[PDB]
Design a protein around this motif. Structure first.
Motif, PDB file in Angstrom:
ATOM      1  N   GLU A 163     -34.463  14.734 -21.458  1.00  0.00           N
ATOM      2  CA  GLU A 163     -34.421  14.093 -20.474  1.00  0.00           C
ATOM      3  C   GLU A 163     -34.814  12.389 -20.388  1.00  0.00           C
ATOM      4  OE1 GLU A 163     -32.554  14.286 -17.450  1.00  0.00           O
ATOM      5  OE2 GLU A 163     -32.174  16.611 -17.187  1.00  0.00           O
ATOM      6  N   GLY A 164     -35.617  12.374 -21.415  1.00  0.00           N
ATOM      7  CA  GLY A 164     -36.291  11.397 -22.270  1.00  0.00           C
ATOM      8  C   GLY A 164     -37.640  11.503 -21.061  1.00  0.00           C
ATOM      9  N   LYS A 165     -38.767  12.080 -20.875  1.00  0.00           N
ATOM     10  CA  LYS A 165     -39.420  11.955 -20.106  1.00  0.00           C
ATOM     11  C   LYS A 165     -40.478  11.366 -20.677  1.00  0.00           C
ATOM     12  CE  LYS A 165     -37.675  14.686 -16.497  1.00  0.00           C
ATOM     13  NZ  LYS A 165     -37.296  16.392 -16.257  1.00  0.00           N
ATOM     14  N   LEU A 166     -40.635  12.736 -21.794  1.00  0.00           N
ATOM     15  CA  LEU A 166     -40.988  12.652 -22.675  1.00  0.00           C
ATOM     16  C   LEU A 166     -41.711  10.321 -24.460  1.00  0.00           C
ATOM     17  CD1 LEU A 166     -42.464  15.606 -24.906  1.00  0.00           C
ATOM     18  CD2 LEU A 166     -43.349  14.874 -22.804  1.00  0.00           C
ATOM     19  N   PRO A 167     -42.777  10.040 -24.281  1.00  0.00           N
ATOM     20  CA  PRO A 167     -42.068   9.162 -25.234  1.00  0.00           C
ATOM     21  C   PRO A 167     -41.842   8.824 -26.681  1.00  0.00           C
ATOM     22  CG  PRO A 167     -44.608   9.674 -25.389  1.00  0.00           C
ATOM     23  CD  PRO A 167     -43.908  10.598 -24.068  1.00  0.00           C
ATOM     24  N   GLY A 168     -40.799   8.119 -26.923  1.00  0.00           N
ATOM     25  CA  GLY A 168     -39.928   8.546 -28.268  1.00  0.00           C
ATOM     26  C   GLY A 168     -40.686   7.553 -28.809  1.00  0.00           C
ATOM     27  N   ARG A 177     -45.848  25.038 -20.040  1.00  0.00           N
ATOM     28  CA  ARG A 177     -45.571  24.476 -21.798  1.00  0.00           C
ATOM     29  C   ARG A 177     -46.643  23.738 -22.470  1.00  0.00           C
ATOM     30  NH1 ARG A 177     -43.675  28.961 -20.072  1.00  0.00           N
ATOM     31  NH2 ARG A 177     -41.232  29.231 -19.819  1.00  0.00           N
ATOM     32  N   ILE A 178     -47.007  23.889 -23.476  1.00  0.00           N
ATOM     33  CA  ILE A 178     -47.776  22.507 -24.253  1.00  0.00           C
ATOM     34  C   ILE A 178     -46.528  21.896 -24.767  1.00  0.00           C
ATOM     35  CG2 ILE A 178     -48.227  24.165 -25.667  1.00  0.00           C
ATOM     36  CD1 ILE A 178     -51.337  22.021 -26.041  1.00  0.00           C
ATOM     37  N   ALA A 208     -48.328  18.669 -21.320  1.00  0.00           N
ATOM     38  CA  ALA A 208     -48.679  19.280 -20.706  1.00  0.00           C
ATOM     39  C   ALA A 208     -47.381  19.423 -19.525  1.00  0.00           C
ATOM     40  CB  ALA A 208     -49.628  20.425 -20.121  1.00  0.00           C
ATOM     41  N   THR A 209     -46.629  20.863 -19.194  1.00  0.00           N
ATOM     42  CA  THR A 209     -45.867  20.970 -18.125  1.00  0.00           C
ATOM     43  C   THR A 209     -46.277  21.852 -17.677  1.00  0.00           C
ATOM     44  OG1 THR A 209     -43.070  21.062 -17.478  1.00  0.00           O
ATOM     45  CG2 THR A 209     -43.640  21.934 -19.716  1.00  0.00           C
ATOM     46  N   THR A 210     -46.064  21.917 -16.311  1.00  0.00           N
ATOM     47  CA  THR A 210     -46.416  23.298 -15.391  1.00  0.00           C
ATOM     48  C   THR A 210     -45.256  23.669 -14.594  1.00  0.00           C
ATOM     49  OG1 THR A 210     -47.403  22.304 -13.774  1.00  0.00           O
ATOM     50  CG2 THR A 210     -49.042  23.444 -15.722  1.00  0.00           C
ATOM     51  N   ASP A 211     -44.136  23.037 -14.234  1.00  0.00           N
ATOM     52  CA  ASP A 211     -43.102  23.364 -13.716  1.00  0.00           C
ATOM     53  C   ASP A 211     -41.282  23.530 -14.581  1.00  0.00           C
ATOM     54  OD1 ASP A 211     -42.765  20.601 -14.571  1.00  0.00           O
ATOM     55  OD2 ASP A 211     -42.952  19.790 -13.192  1.00  0.00           O
ATOM     56  N   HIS A 212     -41.707  23.911 -15.669  1.00  0.00           N
ATOM     57  CA  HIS A 212     -40.606  24.179 -16.508  1.00  0.00           C
ATOM     58  C   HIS A 212     -39.974  22.532 -16.963  1.00  0.00           C
ATOM     59  CE1 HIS A 212     -36.682  26.852 -18.081  1.00  0.00           C
ATOM     60  NE2 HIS A 212     -37.783  27.251 -18.220  1.00  0.00           N
ATOM     61  N   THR A 236     -41.254  17.905 -15.118  1.00  0.00           N
ATOM     62  CA  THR A 236     -42.467  16.643 -15.360  1.00  0.00           C
ATOM     63  C   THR A 236     -43.503  17.481 -16.217  1.00  0.00           C
ATOM     64  OG1 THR A 236     -44.114  17.538 -13.099  1.00  0.00           O
ATOM     65  CG2 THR A 236     -42.528  16.276 -12.656  1.00  0.00           C
ATOM     66  N   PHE A 237     -44.481  15.814 -16.365  1.00  0.00           N
ATOM     67  CA  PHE A 237     -45.013  15.834 -17.928  1.00  0.00           C
ATOM     68  C   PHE A 237     -46.508  14.994 -17.501  1.00  0.00           C
ATOM     69  CE2 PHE A 237     -40.681  16.638 -19.542  1.00  0.00           C
ATOM     70  CZ  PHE A 237     -40.710  17.950 -20.508  1.00  0.00           C
ATOM     71  N   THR A 238     -47.076  15.599 -18.720  1.00  0.00           N
ATOM     72  CA  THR A 238     -48.588  15.028 -18.209  1.00  0.00           C
ATOM     73  C   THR A 238     -49.192  14.986 -19.566  1.00  0.00           C
ATOM     74  OG1 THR A 238     -49.221  15.550 -15.785  1.00  0.00           O
ATOM     75  CG2 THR A 238     -50.961  15.294 -17.413  1.00  0.00           C
ATOM     76  N   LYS A 239     -49.850  13.745 -19.955  1.00  0.00           N
ATOM     77  CA  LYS A 239     -50.891  14.081 -21.366  1.00  0.00           C
ATOM     78  C   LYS A 239     -52.184  14.281 -21.495  1.00  0.00           C
ATOM     79  CE  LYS A 239     -52.746  10.044 -24.621  1.00  0.00           C
ATOM     80  NZ  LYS A 239     -51.457  10.546 -25.709  1.00  0.00           N
ATOM     81  N   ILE A 240     -52.510  15.237 -22.522  1.00  0.00           N
ATOM     82  CA  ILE A 240     -53.904  15.290 -22.296  1.00  0.00           C
ATOM     83  C   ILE A 240     -54.289  15.669 -23.410  1.00  0.00           C
ATOM     84  CG2 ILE A 240     -53.078  17.667 -20.742  1.00  0.00           C
ATOM     85  CD1 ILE A 240     -52.619  19.664 -23.344  1.00  0.00           C
ATOM     86  N   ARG A 241     -53.843  14.777 -24.301  1.00  0.00           N
ATOM     87  CA  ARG A 241     -54.101  14.552 -25.299  1.00  0.00           C
ATOM     88  C   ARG A 241     -54.419  13.049 -26.073  1.00  0.00           C
ATOM     89  NH1 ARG A 241     -56.905  18.464 -24.580  1.00  0.00           N
ATOM     90  NH2 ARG A 241     -58.413  19.542 -25.881  1.00  0.00           N
TER      91      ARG A 241
END
Lengths: 89, 108
Positions: free
Chosen positions: B58-63, B85-86, B96-100, B103-108
């Motif tokens: 879905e291209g949500k993570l930075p490429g 999932r990490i 990190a994603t907590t909704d399969h 959505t994603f959130t940068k944690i590092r």
């Protein structure tokens, strides 16, 4: 030999497409309803062999380009080992 | 056993590999894991699914040119899997994603 059926003429959006897949494939309650979640389901939930019959695909394409992206994930899973037979009827 | 978002993220940044409690789906399946049976803990005690390639469809993570991603299960103990999932890249960005994967959130 499991079978999943998609009645293309009933798909009215990409969200609706994912909801139908969730039902037909008996996916987990938390199914993400996106391409990555679909790939996850095809590689970590769905049991094979599987026959996926997608009727009136042309209609799904119209109500929706999102349909082709979903079909592509199934074809990729197939290329990568999943015993999937796709019927576009 | 290390299976938390921060625990696994720290381990990945330090050793550039997942903790020993992780196994791929290919390995798990070969050991008798059948998702619909919720028997991962029966065939692979203490293990969590992890290490497989994540295609960021879905291209949500930075490429970035050359950057690839992998994923791993988080907070799993036994029974059916959850939606946590990490996600870690070849150049060590960690999300990190907590909704399969919705959505994603940068944690590092």
């Amino acid at each position: 030999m499991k079978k999943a059926v998609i009645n293309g003429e009933q798909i009215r959006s990409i969200s609706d497409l994912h909801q139908t897949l969730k039902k037909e494939l008996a996916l987990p309650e938390y199914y993400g309803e996106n391409l990555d979640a679909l790939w996850a389901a095809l590689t970590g939930w769905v049991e094979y062999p599987l026959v996926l019959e997608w009727r009136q695909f042309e209609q799904s394409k119209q109500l929706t380009n999102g349909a082709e992206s979903v079909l592509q994930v199934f074809r990729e899973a197939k290329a990568e080992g999943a015993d999937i037979t796709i019927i576009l009827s | 056993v290390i299976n938390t978002f921060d625990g696994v993220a720290d381990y990945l940044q330090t050793y550039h590999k997942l903790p020993d409690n992780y196994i791929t789906k290919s390995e798990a399946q070969a050991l008798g894991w059948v998702a619909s049976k919720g028997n991962l803990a029966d065939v692979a005690p203490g293990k969590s699914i992890g290490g497989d390639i994540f295609s960021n469809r879905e291209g949500k993570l930075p490429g970035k040119s050359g950057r690839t991603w992998r994923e791993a299960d988080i907070n799993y103990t036994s029974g059916f899997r959850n939606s946590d999932r990490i996600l870690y890249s070849s150049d060590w960005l960690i999300y990190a994603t907590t909704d399969h994967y919705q959505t994603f959130t940068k944690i590092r």
